[PDB]
Structure 1
């Protein structure tokens, strides 16, 4: 047991407030310090604060103080995290962490170090709107091994998933991490290296799925004729 489960991903606008829950299954929710740690995309780990429900005690990190509220609900074994006055620089994955212990009860003592983590919750802060992607083909060069793909451009928010030929094509497939354009919209690229001899005959279809916008697009990548 002792399984921390966090709430689903959040997409908020600047100036708004978000609340991330962390339900502790099994074990004993009241005794130990449940802390919160965020991880900015491509960045490191940063401690925000913690709480011990039994003693009614909360500690906040100076960078978050006055702009954060960590609460504890012993009735449902669920610790909460409220983040007010959100900014694009708050965009990150927020982890809930409980300190470990050597034994249980009067027996041993908590270790302070985080031994149990939740899966994390992606908080996305942007003024951009939900938008389905536009799929453009990366035509295999007319000029061994060739390379083709589909450009997934101008969508919001993350994530976008891409399969090739309904999943029948897995090796040689590369789906790069998306980039955030200056427009505020995301854009990734997905490619797959295939033998040239099959280019004329074999049909290649990239299956782009974007759940946040509930949009599904299949795009056949065929060689450019000229």
Structure 2
């Protein structure tokens, strides 16, 4: 049982964008398919539904006339075409399976996909620039000194930051992103390590930004 969704991204207000969702593991041709969106940090919002035969489509009032739902049972896909997008449409969209099979009355969602993020902001997509927050040379001999990475000027969210490709996890703090005055995001990832370890073990942070296909490895040295 699996619903894999695709087609997300960033799209300027007023333009169009089509989401697709492929199903595998069940008799897709007999289940009604829902589209349900969720704004960042807010609750769930029902978007649309299409019956098992594809001859009954229902849309929410806030997306009526703009969105259009379609299905293809020969390939087990559901497509949601959204044109004339407002900024309030920025959300994470799930495709979901209807609990009850082979009906014209729709009941609820029991199998949910992972979702596709749709951002409407007029700003473009920019990969992040990674700057090293290098350890101070005053650090005591003991001494528990600290270093890190500054992931600056990226859009949209999110970026994932690891250390030594995951080999370093203890004492790592990756802060939540902040929205800079430029309209782009920025965060910091800091690690506290024994001062006697500097100059002996290589410290590299790995920054990943999927929306821009950006993979950065930043080596931090004193």
- Counterparts of 1:1-226 in structure 2, within 5 Å, are 1=1, 3-54=2-53, 56-101=55-100, 112-140=107-135, 142=138, 145-199=144-198, 201-223=200-222
Task: Normalising by structure 2, report the TM-score.
Answer: 0.83
Unmatched 5+ stretches in structure 2: none
1:104-157 alpha-carbon deviations (Å, 9 max, x no partner): 779xx9982211111111112222223232212233454653332111000123
User: What is the CA–CA distance in structure 2 between the aligned matches of 1:190 and 1:173, rounded to whole Å?
Assistant: 7
Give the deviation of 1:211 after TM superposition: 4.2
Higher mean displacement: 143-152 or 80-89: 143-152
Q: 1:96 to 1:170 in 2, by over 3 A?
A: same
TM norm structure 1: 0.82
1:57 positional shift = 0.9
CA distance in 2, matches of 1:91, 1:13: 11
Equivalent residues of 2:70, 2:80 under 8 A apart: yes
Q: Is the contact made by 1:100 and 1:110 (CA closer than 8 Å) also made in structure 2?
A: no
Contact 2:7 2:18 in 1 (8 A): no
Aligned residues: 218
CA distance, structure 2, for counterparts of residue 74 and residue 168 of structure 1: 45
Cα distance change on mapping 1:95 and 1:145 into 2, 3 Å: same
Classify the secondary structure of the residue corresponding to 1:184: coil
Post-superposition offset of 1:178: 2.7
Distance 1:32 1:210, change over 3 A: closer
**Aligned to 1:89, what secondary structure does the other structure show?**
helix
Q: Give the drift of 1:78.
A: 1.4
Q: Out of 200-209 and 77-86, give the one that drifted further.
A: 200-209
